[PDB]
């Protein structure tokens, strides 16, 4: 392992997603106790044990019992997923958006198990450390030139589809990558129509697992009430909406944005959220959450056979009589409907 073989720009990206150091920092930011059970000793069974105990928590909330029923359930959860609340007594998990908070945590943790496994497999042979990680990812990362028409589309995709309601930060595209996870091309539903290039943002610790294992669905033991539109793979057409799931801070103001070709097909359109949306798909190939703002049909350029909704995100006239989501929510429930294509290294410009 002498001189690295990878592109210098790829080397920068490899070190970034493969930093076990910040992985602890973000888990500690989520209040996870790295001391009581370090990330290095994280079994998938522990996470499947965590999911089950979250389901026992939804079983309490649905039954409405807030006594010991919930107090025992939450503690049992915390024992498998050690937390750190210090002074205050640990909190009771009571809401759909508190449930989603922990399913977010268990996902990020599972994507870290994948990660540390890949960094621990580096032995010490004839390859440079960074090159060994890349090979283990079994996914290709071609860096694109800033003057590429691909780059021209992405920057105009990035900023022109930045929602006006996420004004507390501007976004700036530091580099752009061509993604091809091995086998993904070989199974993408080429048949399905409505082929679109959709956003997915995720925390920094998750990208090794995402570039290696794709974007899986939720395990069966997960609480069903936790997922907004059901156990699927969520996307958005607005760059800022997916960039919010990057969870960049004013101090760690860099992130990664996953533009992937999503085979949506015929959409089931919904206004109010509903987790049991997978049961009511009935031949439709995806669920679409209907918002007020979205890129207008008059700016839909095509890139490698996929529709890229540019232009300013005009209004859509959507309004629910009975909550109306502001922005559109796409959900595909099988990975064959998703092929990753472009990854974006994005710097966040927060405003005070
Ligand atoms: C319910 C839900 C979950 N995740 C996302 C993302 C993302 N992960 O980038 C975008 N919209 N969205 C919506």
Q: From the CA of 87, how far away is ligand 1's center (Å)?
A: 32
Contact 264, 330 (CB under 8 A): yes
CA distance 23 to 109: 9
CA of 76 to the centre of ligand 1 (A): 28
Same fold, 8-137 and 139-350: no
Binding-site entries for NAD(+): 200-202, 209, 216, 242
Question: Is the distance from CB of 26 to CB of 205 less than 8 angstroms?
Answer: yes
- Pocket, ligand 1, Cβ cutoff 6 A: 199-202, 228, 234, 236, 241-242, 245, 329
Instruction: Give the method used.
Output: X-ray
Q: Hey, which of 166, 231, 244, 245 would you mutate to test ligand 1's pocket, going by the most ligand atoms within 8 Å of its Cβ?
A: 245
What is the tally of helices (H) and strands (E) in the chain?
A: 9, 11
Binding positions are: 200-202, 209, 216, 242
| Annotation says 178 is catalytic | no
Distance CA 295, CA 309 (A): 6
What is the best residue among 225, 236, 257 to mutate for testing ligand 1's pocket, by most ligand atoms within 8 Å of CB?
A: 236
The DSSP result for 178-194, as a single string, is EEEETTTTTTS-SS-SS
- Cβ neighbours around 269 below 10 Å, total: 12
Query: Which atom, in ligand 1's list, is nearest to the CA of 202?
Result: 8
* Direct distance between the N- and C-terminal alpha carbons of the chain, in angstroms, rounded to an integer: 45
Phi-psi region of 70 (alpha: psi -120 to 50; beta: other; left: phi over 0): alpha
Cβ pair 268, 277 in contact under 8 A: yes
- Say how far apart CA 206 and CA 210 lie, in whole Å: 6
Query: Going along the chain, which residue ranges are E strands?
Result: 139-143, 169-181, 196-201, 233-235, 254-262, 267-270, 286-289, 300-303, 306-309, 329-332, 338-350
- Domains of the chain, by residue range, sit at 8-137, 139-350
Question: Ligand 1: distance of its center to the CA of 200 in Å?
Answer: 7
Q: Report which ligand 1 atom has the smallest distance to the Cα of 227.
A: 1
- Cα(67) to ligand 1 centroid in Å equals 33
CATH number 3.90.228.10 given to 139-350: yes
Chosen CATH of 8-137 out of 1.20.142.10, 3.40.50.300, 3.40.50.10490, 3.60.15.30: 1.20.142.10
Using only C-alpha atoms, the chain has a radius of gyration, in whole angstroms, of 21
């Amino acid at each position: 392992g002498p001189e690295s073989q990878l592109d210098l720009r790829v080397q920068e990206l490899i070190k970034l997603i493969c930093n076990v150091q910040a992985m602890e920092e973000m888990m500690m930011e989520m209040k996870y106790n790295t001391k009581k059970a370090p990330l290095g000793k994280l079994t998938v069974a522990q996470i499947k044990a965590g999911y089950q105990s979250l389901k026992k928590i939804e079983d309490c909330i649905r039954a409405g019992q807030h006594g010991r029923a919930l107090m025992e359930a939450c503690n049992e959860f915390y024992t498998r997923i050690p937390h750190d609340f210090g002074l205050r007594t640990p909190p009771l998990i009571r809401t759909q958006k508190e449930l989603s908070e922990k399913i977010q945590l268990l996902e990020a943790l599972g994507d870290i198990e994948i990660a540390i496994k890949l960094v621990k497999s580096e032995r010490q042979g004839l390859e440079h450390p960074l090159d060994q990680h890349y090979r283990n990812l079994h996914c290709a990362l071609r860096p694109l030139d800033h003057e590429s028409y691909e780059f021209k589309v992405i920057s105009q995709y990035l900023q022109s589809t930045h929602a006006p309601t996420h004004s507390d930060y501007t976004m700036t595209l530091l580099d752009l990558f061509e993604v091809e996870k091995d086998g993904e091309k070989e199974a993408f539903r080429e048949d399905l129509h409505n082929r679109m290039l959709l956003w997915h943002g995720s925390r920094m610790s998750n990208w090794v697992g995402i570039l290696s294992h794709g974007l899986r669905i939720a395990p069966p033991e997960a609480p069903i009430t936790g997922y907004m539109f059901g156990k699927g793979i969520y996307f958005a057409d607005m760059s800022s909406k997916s960039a919010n799931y990057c969870f960049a801070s004013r101090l760690k103001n860099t992130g990664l944005l996953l533009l992937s070709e999503v085979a949506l097909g015929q959409c089931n359109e919904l206004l109010e959220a509903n987790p049991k949306a997978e049961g009511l798909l009935q031949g439709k190939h995806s669920t679409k959450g209907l918002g007020k703002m979205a890129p207008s049909s008059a700016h839909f350029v095509t890139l490698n056979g996929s529709t890229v909704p540019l232009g300013p995100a005009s209004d859509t006239g959507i309004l629910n009589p009975d909550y109306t989501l502001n922005y559109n929510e796409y959900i595909v429930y099988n990975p064959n409907q998703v092929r990753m294509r472009y990854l974006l290294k994005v710097q966040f410009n927060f405003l005070q």
